[PDB]
DNA sequence: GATACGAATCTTTTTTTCCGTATAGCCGTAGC
DNA sequence: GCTACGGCTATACGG
DNA sequence: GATTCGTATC
């Protein structure tokens, strides 16, 4: 049928999970017609867009949805003058006039919707021109901002659109969706499971999501009938298993140059990644009680170094190597 | 149909009277109307200080009807380049007034947008028409204008808003709204509102929002952070207890479990611990420096994201190591 | 034609090199209709694209492989004309970033939403090379266009991937298979077409020299076929790329002289290595690797020298001009090793 | 490579202006043109390699001399030439007979890149005044000849519309529904609709919707069609079905959309094919 | 005759606005 | 007296 | 601005 990413997006309000003070406002915004200009931010799959369409879809139905809402993501043109245009003239247009069913169904706001998903790819002059266009047509036209870093939004649209930080999705915040899709979609895994899941999927619903799905495809493949480990999960999950990083640590403890070389290479030549690994080796090493106050601040500033330099789309083996050298020099 | 409308729309002043804040801006700007006489008006300030309010409210008061013939407004929404400045500015600044008499005032909403060329065009026009025509600019960075335009343009300053205007803007809110707001609540508002005016109504509207049910029900300091989504000062104080004086294990376990109990963001904590460490007596100045540096580098690399764990340890790391030099 | 497709494996069960990965691939392949979008992150030439077609033709049966390959012309925001080709095949569409630069987004922007109007398979090869803007178009059209479409992209060192898109994608890891693998396969090639063979230890030196890829293994044992008159010898010499030959005499010569005139002399030698359109990364990587094979420096020295990697490949990735950073690696080299 | 030709506009009429109908379709959609001039049959072309193709048939009868010879197959000679240069031949030509006579319009190819000798005769009032012409033209190659093909059409969803005749009543009416479209100046796509006789012209936009529908009665040759095409291409099409009375439109469902138009000669038939791509899609 | 002076060489492939041309639409006059 | 076509002009496009 | 070669002038 359809992945259950998408099968299980939230249809009304009440589906979205953990993010109570978001669903509650927008809850509160349905039975008023006061909505303000919302900025959603917060980390990727946490449930922004699920919820900008589910408050859309209850705001005015399937029906007044065509004509009271427009949707601009960056699959399509929005640069100065498309910001000075559409927008505009969108904004400037009178609100269509609802049908019965629709008034009698669903509150159907004096207002409309211009919904602009993934604002954090705009240029500063399309929101300089997008600041006015709010402000002038805020009583006929209203404006959702949704992006994953706040600070490429600038200053004065921070300012006119109201604030809604989306939570990251931890074990306990999502683990009653995740048991709720495993108990929908019929699978079977041990006690700990999915509490894996979702701290593999560090503030991700999403990843969790699927990573659950491809765990029940393997599952169903074997035809064992037996329920998914932990051990399955962190294996297509991509984690490192607890013996390659071991091996890894005794290696770097012997600071021999030669020898943490060929282990790197033989290690990059298994197509592991090194944000996972150096996550793993940060977690070991800030948990193990074996090392001093001094060893650990140096070990987090590497870490940390390392994870920005990795971050920029540089090369792997290289970051690994040279993270390995530094810390067996530490 | 003001009650249709987001709380940063529904508060905007209508009268010089209403705006607080800039009383030696609105007091000087009232004695030039009273006066007769006003000179090409810049204002200047950071976001939400009341700018685009008080020039329009000054309009008003001006031109009481002829607001639509006698008031020219442009802004970045609007084409304002070359062809634009040289007919549709002219245009305006030419003609005779219709029958107010005074002057035809032109309003540059976020001046600092436009281009240098048509800034260039437009201050012979500012210098040229200045008979029967005045200029308003308005622009929250200076550098990206021109400095002959500077140079004639009279500046005025837009500071943050302060307390007082705050609370008075906050009790008319809570007047019109039937509210109640606890003076805890009050003070971590205006904490939070940086001298901004639309984070405040946006907030207070949030709040009311969150509450069950608005009348007979307060806003406390909970009801703030928890639909806002802000650590709480207890909360920043006992992560920067944990940090200093506690080892390692247990300050990262005070540290997840602070930002695991309400669902709180690093670079949050990372302002308030910024903000706390401001008010620390520092006997080494070596001590500043490490935090500043590497609380900036953690701060952009969260900006451009990351490891979010990485990235907690390495704020504790960097407080730790910098904290040693003062030994 | 080479031996590379020659025996390049067809089918899901011909896949003989890593049994958990093909075991994974037809658990993927047993229902193709709540099929994801994959990553396939791993090893160059570990047989990440030849384990895609695999499981498409798993999934929509035999002819995968018939492809026709078309012109298409596309426009930027300002008046221009872009050839790129399109390699397309029966419900199955190829789109590779190496031929256009940072026009990258409309094309592939135009190409994804005439395709997406069952689902077709996309195929994008090296999902490295966009430019953070094709992935902010890509994540939101097969966010809404998953029922129509399916995203199946190989690349290498998934790092520059954005956050949002390797959440949006399952994420399959391709291990290099071992040496003795590579031996089979070899063995298995040289079965089918007789060599000589003298020893069973050149096709070893033949995959340790490869480490770990099939493709350069293949063409090494085709060129010492074809130069030893279809014959191979114990003695023969390993066959190295070119670029290999010269990053390694511009390490000698950096270890050997450390000078201005060597520096500008090392500059030349990137500047002919930059005009053979060798991407500057692999370059400095290759680069520091060779010098880390010096037996005469010390552990400081490879310490420093791999620190400056660091340093400099960071630099190259978040700059504009590749020769600065090799220069300025090349030069702290030169001044750490003196 | 001897080509020559003999034209006689006032002895022979439908031909000559079916000639001069595609010079003019030519000339309009885009600068030069491919003239095939195989042995039985003239073939004028305007390959654009979205914009659309023009593939006009004209038999060898039209003209009153038809000596084509060359090494290539079937004595093949193609050429590409100006359109406004032929386009001004043609109308000198056009009002020599309109100031009043009768003579022919002879054509030679006298010469890799050669011209044709167009010279005719005209007489003002009994006086001899020669006019002379030469177009520069290129010759193809015969591989070239081969890249250039006409684009076959489906017919899995293709369905026909016989418009009516232009001489007949609805005709008038018919061509004022065509160019209805064409007053509106801001206006780059038509939105056709054919459901199983209607024809709707539907321009829907952000701001504004058209409907323009035709009431007429109309007749399908032997379910929905929509196909999304430029304006310039409607006003060429339009420019065809007034010169033609027998007039033919394909509809492709999002594929392609087909304006037939043929002149009955009898004798082989003169017809005019412009293929017309989707600007994009539904 | 020594020196100051001069020549030759050391080199290249998004957004706004503006200048001139293309083109379609409309009005005025010759002809049917 | 009406229509067709040529000349003049306003507007969009391109580089 | 630097180098190298050639003239006119002191
Ligand atoms: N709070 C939530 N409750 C239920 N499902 C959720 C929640 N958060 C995320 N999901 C699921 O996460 C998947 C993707 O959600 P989206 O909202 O489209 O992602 P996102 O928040 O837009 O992140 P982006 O697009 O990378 S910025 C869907 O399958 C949702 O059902
Ligand atoms: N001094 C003030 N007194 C009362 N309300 C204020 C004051 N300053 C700001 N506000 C409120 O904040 C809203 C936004 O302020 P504006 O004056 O419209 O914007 P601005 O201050 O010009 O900031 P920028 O630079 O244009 S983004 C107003 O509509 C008021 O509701
Ligand atoms: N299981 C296998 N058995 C034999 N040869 C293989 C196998 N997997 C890959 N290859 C060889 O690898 C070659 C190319 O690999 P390729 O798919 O290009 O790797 P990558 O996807 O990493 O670029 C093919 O010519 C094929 O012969
Ligand atoms: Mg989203
Ligand atoms: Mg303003």
């Known amino acids: 049928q359809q992945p259950w990413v998408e099968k299980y997006r939230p249809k009304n309000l009440d589906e979205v999970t953990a993010q109570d003070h978001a669903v509650t406002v927008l809850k509160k915004t349905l039975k008023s017609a006061n909505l303000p200009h919302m900025l959603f931010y917060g980390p990727p799959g946490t449930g922004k867009t699920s919820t900008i369409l589910a408050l859309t879809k209850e705001l005015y139905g399937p029906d007044l949805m065509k004509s009271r809402i427009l949707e601009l993501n960056a699959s399509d043109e929005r640069g100065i003058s498309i910001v000075r245009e559409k927008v505009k003239n969108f904004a400037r247009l009178t609100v269509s006039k609802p049908s019965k069913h629709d008034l009698e169904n669903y509150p159907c706001p004096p207002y409309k919707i211009i919904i602009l998903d993934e604002a954090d790819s705009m240029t500063a002059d399309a929101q300089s021109a997008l600041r006015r266009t709010m402000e002038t047509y805020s009583g006929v036209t209203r404006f959702c901002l949704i992006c994953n870093y706040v600070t490429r939004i600038i200053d004065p649209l921070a300012s006119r659109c109201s604030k809604f930080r989306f939570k990251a999705l931890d074990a306990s915040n999502a683990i009653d969706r995740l048991r709720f899709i495993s108990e929908q979609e019929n699978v079977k895994c041990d006690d700990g499971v999915l509490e894996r899941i979702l701290d593999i999927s560090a503030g991700d619903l999403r990843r969790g999501i699927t990573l659950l799905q491809s765990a029940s495809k393997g599952a169903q493949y074997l035809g064992d009938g037996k329920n998914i480990t932990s051990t399955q999960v962190e294996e297509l999950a991509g984690v490192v298993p607890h013996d390659i990083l071991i091996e890894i640590v005794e290696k770097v403890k012997s600071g021999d140059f030669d020898e943490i070389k060929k282990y790197v290479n033989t290690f990059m030549k298994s197509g592991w990644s090194a944000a996972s690994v150096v996550n793993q080796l940060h977690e070991y090493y800030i948990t193990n009680d074996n090392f001093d106050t001094n060893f650990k601040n140096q070990i987090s500033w590497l870490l940390f170094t390392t994870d920005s330099r990795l971050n920029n789309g540089t090369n792997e083996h290289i970051q690994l190597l040279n993270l390995l050298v530094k810390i067996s020099q530490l | 149909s003001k009650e249709n409308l987001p709380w940063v729309e529904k508060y905007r002043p209508e009268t010089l009277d209403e705006v607080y804040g800039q009383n030696e801006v609105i007091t000087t700007v009232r004695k030039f109307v009273d006066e007769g006489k006003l000179p090409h008006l810049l204002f200047y300030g950071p976001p939400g200080t009341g700018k685009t309010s008080t020039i329009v409210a000054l309009a008003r008061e001006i031109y009481g009807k002829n607001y639509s013939n006698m008031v020219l407004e442009l802004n970045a929404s609007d084409d304002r380049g070359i062809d634009v400045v040289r007919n549709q500015i002219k245009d305006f600044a030419s003609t005779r007034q219709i029958f107010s008499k005074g002057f035809k005032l032109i309003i540059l909403d976020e001046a600092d947008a436009m281009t240098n060329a048509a800034q260039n065009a437009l201050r012979r026009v500012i210098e040229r028409y200045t008979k029967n025509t005045r200029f308003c600019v308005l622009a929250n960075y200076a550098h990206k204008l021109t400095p002959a335009l500077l140079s004639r343009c009279t500046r005025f300053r837009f500071q943050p808003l302060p307390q007082e205007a705050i609370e008075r803007r906050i009790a008319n809110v809570l007047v019109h709204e039937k509210l109640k707001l606890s003076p805890n609540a009050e003070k971590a508002l205006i904490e939070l509102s940086n001298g901004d005016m639309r984070r405040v109504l946006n907030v207070l509207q949030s709040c009311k929002a969150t509450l069950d049910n608005p009348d007979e029900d307060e806003i406390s300091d909970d009801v703030i952070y928890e639909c806002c989504g802000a650590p709480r000062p207890s909360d920043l104080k006992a992560v920067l207890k944990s940090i200093l004086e506690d080892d390692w294990g247990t300050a990262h376990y005070t540290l997840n479990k602070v930002r695991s109990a309400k669902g709180l963001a690093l670079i949050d904590l990372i302002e308030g611990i910024v903000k706390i460490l401001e008010d620390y007596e520092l006997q080494n100045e070596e001590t500043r420096v490490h935090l500043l540096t590497k609380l900036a580098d953690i701060e952009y690399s969260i900006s451009k994201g990351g490891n979010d764990q990485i990235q907690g340890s390495a704020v504790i790391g960097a407080i730790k190591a910098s904290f040693e030099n003062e030994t | 034609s080479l031996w590379v497709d020659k025996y390049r494996p067809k089918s899901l069960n011909a896949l003989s090199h890593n049994e958990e990965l093909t075991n994974f691939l037809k658990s993927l392949s047993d229902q193709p209709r709540d099929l994801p979008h994959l990553l396939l992150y791993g090893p160059n030439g570990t047989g990440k694209k030849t384990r895609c077609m695999a499981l498409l033709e798993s999934i929509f049966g035999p002819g995968v492989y018939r492809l026709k390959i078309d012109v298409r012309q596309f426009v930027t925001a300002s008046n221009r004309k872009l050839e790129l080709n399109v390699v397309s095949s029966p419900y199955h569409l190829e789109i590779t970033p190496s031929d256009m630069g940072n026009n990258d987004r409309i094309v592939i922007q135009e190409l994804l939403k005439e395709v997406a109007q069952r689902y077709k398979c996309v195929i994008i090869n090296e999902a490295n090379s966009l430019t953070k803007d094709a992935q902010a178009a890509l994540r939101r059209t097969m966010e809404k266009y998953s029922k129509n479409i399916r995203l199946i992209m190989v690349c290498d060192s998934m790092s520059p991937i954005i956050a949002p898109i390797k959440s949006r994608c399952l994420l399959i890891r391709c291990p290099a298979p071992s040496d003795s693998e590579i031996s089979t396969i070899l063995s298995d090639v040289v079965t089918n077409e007789r060599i000589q063979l003298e020893t069973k230890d050149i096709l070893k030196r033949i995959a340790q020299a490869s480490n770990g890829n099939l493709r350069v293994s293949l063409l090494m044992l085709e060129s010492m076929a074809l130069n030893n008159e279809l014959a191979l010898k114990s003695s023969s010499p390993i066959i190295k790329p070119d670029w290999i030959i010269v990053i390694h005499k511009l390490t000698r010569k950096i270890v050997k002289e450390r000078s201005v005139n060597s520096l500008i002399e090392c500059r030349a030698v990137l500047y002919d290595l930059l005009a053979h359109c060798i991407p500057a990364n692999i370059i400095l990587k290759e680069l520091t690797f060779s010098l880390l094979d010096v037996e005469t420096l010390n552990t400081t020295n490879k310490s420093s020298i791999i620190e400056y990697s660091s340093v400099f490949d960071e630099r190259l990735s978040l700059g504009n001009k590749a020769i600065f950073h090799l220069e300025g690696f090349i030069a702290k080299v030169m001044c750490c090793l003196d | ?282």
């Open chain 4, 1 to 282: 490579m001897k080509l020559k030709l003999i034209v006689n506009g006032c002895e022979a009429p439908d031909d000559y202006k079916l000639l001069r109908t595609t010079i003019n379709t030519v000339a309009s959609l885009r600068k030069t043109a491919i003239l095939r001039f195989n042995s039985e049959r003239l073939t004028i072309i305007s390959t654009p390699k979205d914009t659309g193709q023009l593939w006009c048939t004209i038999p060898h009868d039209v003209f009153r001399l038809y000596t084509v010879i060359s090494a290539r197959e079937l004595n093949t000679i193609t050429m590409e030439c100006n359109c406004d240069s032929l386009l001004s031949v043609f109308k000198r030509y056009d009002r020599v007979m309109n100031q009043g006579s009768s003579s022919n319009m002879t054509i030679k190819l006298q010469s890799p890149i050669c011209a044709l000798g167009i010279t005719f005769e005209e007489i003002v009032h009994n006086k001899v005044i020669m006019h002379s012409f030469k177009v520069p033209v290129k010759l193809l190659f015969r591989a070239q000849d081969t890249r250039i093909q006409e684009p076959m059409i489906n017919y899995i969803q293709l369905m026909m519309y016989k418009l009516p005749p232009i001489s007949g009543e609805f005709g008038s009416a018919f061509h004022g529904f065509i160019r209805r479209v064409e007053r509106y100046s801001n206006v780059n796509h038509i939105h056709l609709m054919g459901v199983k006789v209607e024809l709707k012209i539907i321009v829907n936009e952000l701001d504004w919707h058209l409907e323009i529908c035709w009431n007429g009665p109309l007749d399908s040759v032997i379910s929905t069609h929509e196909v999304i095409i430029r304006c310039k291409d409607w006003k060429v099409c339009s420019k065809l079905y007034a010169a033609f009375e027998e007039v033919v439109l394909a509809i492709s469902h999002d594929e392609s959309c087909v304006f037939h138009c043929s002149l009955d000669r009898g004798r082989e038939r003169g017809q005019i094919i412009y293929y017309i791509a989707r600007s994009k899609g539904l």
